[PDB]
Design a protein around this ligand. Structure first.
Ligand SMILES: Nc1nc2c(ncn2[C@@H]2O[C@H](COP(=O)(O)OP(=O)(O)OP(=O)(O)O)[C@@H](O)[C@H]2O)c(=O)[nH]1
Ligand SMILES: Nc1ncnc2c1ncn2[C@@H]1O[C@H](COP(=O)(O)OP(=O)(O)CP(=O)(O)O)[C@@H](O)[C@H]1O
Ligand SMILES: Nc1nc2c(ncn2[C@@H]2O[C@H](COP(=O)(O)OP(=O)(O)O)[C@@H](O)[C@H]2O)c(=O)[nH]1
Ligand SMILES: [Ca+2]
Ligand SMILES: [Ca+2]
Ligand SMILES: [Ca+2]
Ligand SMILES: [Mg+2]
Ligand SMILES: [Mg+2]
Ligand SMILES: [Mg+2]
Lengths: 348, 53, 437, 423
């Protein structure tokens, strides 16, 4: 009889995993503070990694990688890419970014302005976006002043002015990929992604109205008037998107986009493996990641960010959560296909 | 990667490599010990009083 | 030459001390009868090994050691054991009933009645010293004597030997080899009262030693003898610089200067490699790079924690055996490009290296195989705060219900000492976080 | 040299005590004449814990036999090992206690108690370093219950910092000599709450059910019950009589988190009926040891929570497999262990097994489920006290009703204290 504890009541993903675990009849849920557990579904913030793996005879597993925050933080990701030789400052799939600390608090203000002034002089498009852990503008003055009005670290990265627009609609979108890393650091890409589409026509001459520029599911369902017009819940899945790429662009989702997505996932996760691997640790970790990508009109894939506590598409909860149990939990605590994941092989 | 202060002798050697630059008094202890003894004496006295009753 | 006095308190301190002095004698060529044929100066001398051994007119080399326990069964092993002839009776101090795993019983009730005698015996050893450096104190956190009497002894030592350094070798409690539930209480109580009196403390978590014995030595259920012989190898690596010719860590003061820039954060992490089973027919001799790389694996640390998620304040590499500086620097360069070694911005990113050409000595019939080269890394990392957090958490669980508190109050301790000690530990955890994040 | 002084009082106390000394004398290789004839040095390593060494290499139990009538101690002196006890350590009157706590505590017992203390003092004076005392008695009678608790009170007055341990047999209407047993047991329990450091609660109802249901004895006798008590007493004192860890005070420190909650439920395995030669595996030993049917307090552990648990394994077995099974019982039923005492389940192993068994396990639990035992006694007490029934036996000895009402409230307070830690 295996034992687990639930320490994040707000996780829709691991509420289903917990539901599945109990349904097997071979897992028992303890009080959240009971130290005699095999599996911890930990809290998002300040997870007590230091107390794991010190119960005699208990093989203990947790659903988060200590140190994975370096990848799942706005400013942290930028610093990681610029300072890690595996990714380098010339990384071709990450938008030119800069970490800007508000003046009321290293910082990259002067470096940003230098590159900003260069684009302005060369007639090039100079539209940046400021965000933290949102404002879109082409004037450096407005971007820096907006950050000083806040008190948290922000990042300024280039705004993809030439995004791939779906038709009909002429509308922006982004691609969410769910990736699972087990205790052995196998990288599993869920076969099912989701396109979070904008239900408004993309307008390049008005960044003030952010409805057609931000493809967040919450913004479209609150400030967009065409929500659900083209696809239910502004969510297009790979089957429809692949069929579209073939009909419109005479190409496939695997060739035009997925190869780059798999390459980006591997690069990011392999880069931090020595820092977060639990191979020789007194406890074991796995974690579910949400990678967000942008695709431009040239079919080049750009990484936008990585989410360390992602939610899932309503239609895909059952399949993904069961997969988490099969490859992440039961592989360590076996019970008494055609896998839904794509293993991204790599050198350890 | 610099080495400094290399010292050698018959039984070994030592050096330094730089990869990058940047109470209660005796009286007070007695009081604490005696205060604890007094507390034990008081607790034992109360027990004996309880048993005498 | 400057002398060092070793003090062993309680069962853990005594049994570990017994294993250490057994090893010291083998390393210096001293026989169980105390004779040392290699020592050509009969009756005296100021050689490096004389920091730990005095000499009688008859040529006997006597450890500068005192053993103290409230129950005699552990120390009776010394009085009749192999090395019974090394110590004279004045050095072995035993009572009749122990502190019952009760810090307050060892510190107050019993400590008050035996402290003066223990200091007198220590004074007799000090009177034999021309320039006493200080003391090395071995004890458990969990025992009533190891925790309670040690803290009282350390307080009196600061009074009677103000200018003398004091180092600790402390056994951190692990339920796998413990039958006492109150050890978190005792550990926090003794750390609070000893913190201001200890210049540098080497904590050894029984959980780490236990798993190294099972994993590397293929011992299914290690005994205290298995644990102590491994611990004594690590202790020997740490104190070798005091007992052999050299220029690194040559006196107790140097341990603090090299390992402790901030006085309260004085708990360096020890990591030792290689630990090879003697039952193996023949093992591939590991290189300098390989044993150095092993110093950054959690599996060979004396306290299980993750130094990848802390900051370093100091790092010292102590090699024994066939090692030349060329290969050390080559290994360090390789590890920097592969490991996550982050120093605090106010400390230099460097390593102090000591090499002793004499490889590790293995006790005949022990569990450890003879190796051509071994290394002990001493790093002052904030990652060891994980061990304080673990211990403080168990404390909080029991103290919230006042479980077992009456045993301590019954010995004359005020309940307020619990919260005073716990708040001190909270301040210690805050100091670590301020430096490491 | 951590000596223990053993006292046995009244009929039950002396009959169980006699069997205890017969069992451990066999384990230590001591014959009925006090002469050692074992074959293992482990038999003598800690022999002085319970035996004094007389001239001629003779070992004499450090035992004091007390009663208010001569009958039972005459049987002991004529029993198997009756000749092994010190003749001067027999202290007895002629009046009897009439199953009356007041006679044992205030009148008949009061006239004899000073002479018992003289023998206790004599034995204590010849101890290198006395650990404490252990008393065997029943709570339902008059001598063991009334005079036994009187003795405990006077021993605590003279030896206030020594550990006092008891094996206390709790009465049951299923195995009853007289109807006043709940009166005597309620009066005694308050004394135990105040004046002992550790009490092993042995319920005659649990002993009966074990003999009848598990051992398949059609007509259990007091002798059959005492066989279980002997085996249990040997099990829980193994860690005192052989090399290990250790002493009564250390045991108390790790078993008793709150001073009044010092009443333990003991258990034993195996309990086999005559399929008796079959080898018993570690899993079987561990599963039975935690089974309610193997426990002797007649309380359902699954009705409360374990504050602390000690388990002793005897015999040449796999200590690796012991830890795996122990860690399996906890990590499979952690809902019955309080989560605010970390690592509150301790395991110890002893190489010497009990006579006739390849291996065995003894269980010592400090469980809040023991409140069920005190609740049963309290309800039986009140059913009679509500009508002042049989009180004249006690008022005739000078007791007042107010002392009964105070004992009633004292034990209900104790029940209330267990209930708060069970939630
Ligand atoms: N490594 C190691 N740990 C030990 C040894 N002996 C005891 N311990 C540990 O020390 C703790 C118990 O404290 P002890 O040193 O035995 O107790 P003490 O200092 O003699 O104090 P009291 O017996 O209570 O008076 C437990 O955590 C044990 O695991 C030993 O020989 N080696
Ligand atoms: N450099 C850039 N160029 C173009 N669009 C961008 C961009 N950076 C962000 N966006 C837009 O912003 C949206 C999401 O922004 P971002 O992911 O930084 O905020 P967020 O993290 O709160 C949403 P989530 O974490 O759920 O993916 C995307 O739909 C994308 O279209
Ligand atoms: N287990 C057991 N219980 C007994 C024995 N003799 C008496 N009892 C119980 O003890 C109580 C009677 O007390 P008893 O010891 O005979 O009275 P005393 O001589 O005045 O102390 C009743 O609850 C009996 O069931 C015995 O030999 N074994
Ligand atoms: Ca000499
Ligand atoms: Ca000092
Ligand atoms: Ca009379
Ligand atoms: Mg995000
Ligand atoms: Mg001890
Ligand atoms: Mg009777």
């Amino acid at each position: 009889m295996y034992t687990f504890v639930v320490r994040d009541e707000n996780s829709s993903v691991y509420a289903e995993v917990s539901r599945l675990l109990l349904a097997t009849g071979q897992w028992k849920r303890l009080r959240k503070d009971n130290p005699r557990f095999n599996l911890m579904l930990g809290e998002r913030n300040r997870l007590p990694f230091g107390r794991l793996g010190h119960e005699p005879g208990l093989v203990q597993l947790v659903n988060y990688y200590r140190g994975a925050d370096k990848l799942c933080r706005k400013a942290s990701l930028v610093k990681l890419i610029k300072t890690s030789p595996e990714l380098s400052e010339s990384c071709t799939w990450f938008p030119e970014s800069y970490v800007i600390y508000p003046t009321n608090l290293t910082d990259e203000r002067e470096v940003f302005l230098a590159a900003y002034n260069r684009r302005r002089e060369g007639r090039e498009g100079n539209v940046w976006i400021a965000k933290s852990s949102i404002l879109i503008s082409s004037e450096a003055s407005e971007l820096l002043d907006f950050i000083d009005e806040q008190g948290q670290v922000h990042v300024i990265q280039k705004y993809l002015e030439k995004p791939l627009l779906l038709e009909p609609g002429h509308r922006k979108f982004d691609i969410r990929s769910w990736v699972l890393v087990d205790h052995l650091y196998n990288i599993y890409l869920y076969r099912e992604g989701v396109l979070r589409t904008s239900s408004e026509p993309y307008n390049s001459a008005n960044f003030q109205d952010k409805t057609c520029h931000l493809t967040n599911h919450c913004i479209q369902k609150e400030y967009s008037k065409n929500y659900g017009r083209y696809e239910e819940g502004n969510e297009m899945f790979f089957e429809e998107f692949n069929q579209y790429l073939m009909d419109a662009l005479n190409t496939t989702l695997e060739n035009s986009i997925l190869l780059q997505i798999k390459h980006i996932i591997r690069s990011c996760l392999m880069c931090i493996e020595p820092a977060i691997s639990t191979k020789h640790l007194h406890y074991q970790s796995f974690q579910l990641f949400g990678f967000d990508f942008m695709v431009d009109e040239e079919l080049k894939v750009w990484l936008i960010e990585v989410n360390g506590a992602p939610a899932c598409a309503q239609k895909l909860y059952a399949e993904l959560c069961q997969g988490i149990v099969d490859v992440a939990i039961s592989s360590v605590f076996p019970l008494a296909p055609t896998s839904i994941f794509i293993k991204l092989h790599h050198h350890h | 990667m610099e080495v400094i202060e290399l010292n050698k002798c018959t039984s070994g050697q030592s050096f330094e490599v730089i990869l990058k630059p940047p109470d209660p008094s005796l009286e007070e202890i007695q009081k604490k010990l005696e205060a604890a003894e007094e507390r034990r004496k008081y607790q034992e006295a109360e027990l004996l009083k309880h048993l005498a009753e | 030459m400057r002398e060092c006095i070793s003090i062993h308190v309680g069962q853990a301190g005594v049994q570990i001390g017994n294993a250490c002095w057994e090893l010291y004698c083998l390393e210096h060529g001293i026989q169980p009868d105390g004779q040392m044929p290699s020592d050509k100066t009969i009756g005296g001398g100021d050689d490096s090994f004389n920091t730990f051994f005095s000499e009688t007119g008859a040529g006997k080399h006597v450890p500068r050691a005192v053993f103290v326990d409230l129950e005699p069964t552990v120390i009776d092993e010394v009085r009749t054991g192999t090395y019974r002839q090394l110590f004279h009776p004045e050095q072995l101090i035993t009572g009749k009933e122990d502190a019952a795993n009760n810090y307050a019983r060892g510190h107050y009730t019993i400590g008050k009645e035996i402290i003066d005698l223990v200091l007198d015996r220590i004074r007799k050893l000090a009177d034999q010293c021309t320039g006493l450096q200080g003391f090395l104190v071995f004890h458990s956190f969990g025992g009533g004597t190891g925790s309670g009497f040690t803290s009282l002894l350390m307080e009196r030592l600061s009074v009677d030997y103000g200018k003398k350094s004091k180092l600790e070798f402390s056994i951190y409690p692990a339920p796998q080899v413990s039958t006492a539930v109150v050890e978190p209480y005792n550990s926090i109580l003794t750390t609070h009262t000893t913190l201001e009196h200890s210049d540098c403390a080497f904590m050894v978590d029984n959980e780490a030693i236990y798993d190294i014995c099972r994993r590397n030595l293929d011992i299914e259920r290690p005994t205290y003898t298995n644990l102590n012989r491994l611990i004594s190898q690590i202790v020997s690596s740490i104190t070798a610089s005091l007992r052999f010719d050299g220029a690194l860590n040559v006196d107790l003061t140097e341990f603090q200067t090299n390992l402790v820039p901030y006085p309260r954060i004085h708990f360096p992490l020890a990591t030792y490699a290689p630990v090879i089973s003697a039952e193996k027919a023949y093992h591939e001799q590991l290189s300098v790079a390989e044993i150095t790389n092993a110093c950054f694996e959690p599996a060979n640390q004396m306290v299980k924690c993750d130094p990848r998620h802390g900051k370093y304040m100091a790092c010292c590499l102590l090699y024994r055996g066939d090692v030349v500086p060329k290969d050390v620097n080559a290994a360090i360069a390789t590890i920097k490009t592969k490991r996550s070694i982050q120093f605090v911005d106010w400390c230099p990113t460097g390593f102090k290296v000591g090499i002793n050409y004499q490889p590790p000595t293995v006790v005949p019939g022990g569990d450890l195989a003879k190796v051509q080269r071994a290394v002990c890394m001493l790093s002052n990392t904030t990652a060891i705060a994980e061990a304080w957090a673990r211990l403080d958490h168990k404390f909080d669980l029991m103290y919230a219900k006042r479980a077992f508190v009456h045993w301590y109050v019954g010995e004359g301790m005020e309940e307020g000492e619990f919260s005073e000690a716990r708040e001190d530990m909270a301040a210690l955890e805050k100091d670590y976080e301020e430096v490491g994040v | 040299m951590r000596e223990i002084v053993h006292i046995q009082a009244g009929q039950c106390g002396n009959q169980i005590g006699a069997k205890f000394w017969e069992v451990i004398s066999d384990e230590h290789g001591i014959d009925p004449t006090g002469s050692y004839h074992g074959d293992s040095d482990l038999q003598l390593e800690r022999i002085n814990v319970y035996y004094n060494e007389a001239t001629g290499n003779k070992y004499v139990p450090r035992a004091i036999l007390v009663d208010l009538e001569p009958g039972t101690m005459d049987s002991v002196r004529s029993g198997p090992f009756g000749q092994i006890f010190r003749p001067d350590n027999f202290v007895f009157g002629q009046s009897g206690a009439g199953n009356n706590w007041a006679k044992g505590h205030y009148t008949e017992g009061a006239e004899l108690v000073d002479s018992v203390l003289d023998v206790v003092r004599k034995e204590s004076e010849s101890c290198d370093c006395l650990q404490g005392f252990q008393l065997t008695h029943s709570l339902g009678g008059g001598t063991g219950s009334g005079m036994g608790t009187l003795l405990i009170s006077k021993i605590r007055e003279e030896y206030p910092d020594r550990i006092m341990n008891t094996f206390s047999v709790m009465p049951s209407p299923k195995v009853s000599d007289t109807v006043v047993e709940p009166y005597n047991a309620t009066l005694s329990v308050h004394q135990l709450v105040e004046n002992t450091d550790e009490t092993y609660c042995i319920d005659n109802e649990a002993l009966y059910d074990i003999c009848f249901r598990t051992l398949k004895l059609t007509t259990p006798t007091y002798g059959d019950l005492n066989h279980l008590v002997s085996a249990t007493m040997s099990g829980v004192t193994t860690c005192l009589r052989f090399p290990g860890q250790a002493d009564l005070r250390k045991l108390a420190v790790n078993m008793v988190p709150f001073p009044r909650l010092h009443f333990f439920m003991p258990g034993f395995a195996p309990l086999t009926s005559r399929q008796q030669y079959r080898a018993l595996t570690v899993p079987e030993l561990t599963q039975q040891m935690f089974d309610s049917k193997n426990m002797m307090a007649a309380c359902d552990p699954r009705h409360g929570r374990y504050l602390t648990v000690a388990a002793i394994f005897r015999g040449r077995m796999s200590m690796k497999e012991v830890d795996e099974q122990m860690l399996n019982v906890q990590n499979k039923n952690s809902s019955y262990f309080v989560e605010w005492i970390p690592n509150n389940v301790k395991t110890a192993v002893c190489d010497i097994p009990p006579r006739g068994l390849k291996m065995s396990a003894t269980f010592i639990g400090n469980s809040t489920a023991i409140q069920e035992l005190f609740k049963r006694i309290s309800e039986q007490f009140t059913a009679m006290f509500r009508r002042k029934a049989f009180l004249h036996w006690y008022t005739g000895e000078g007791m007042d009703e107010m002392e009964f009402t105070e004992a009633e409230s004292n034990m209900n307070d104790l029940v209330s204290e267990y209930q708060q830690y069970q939630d």
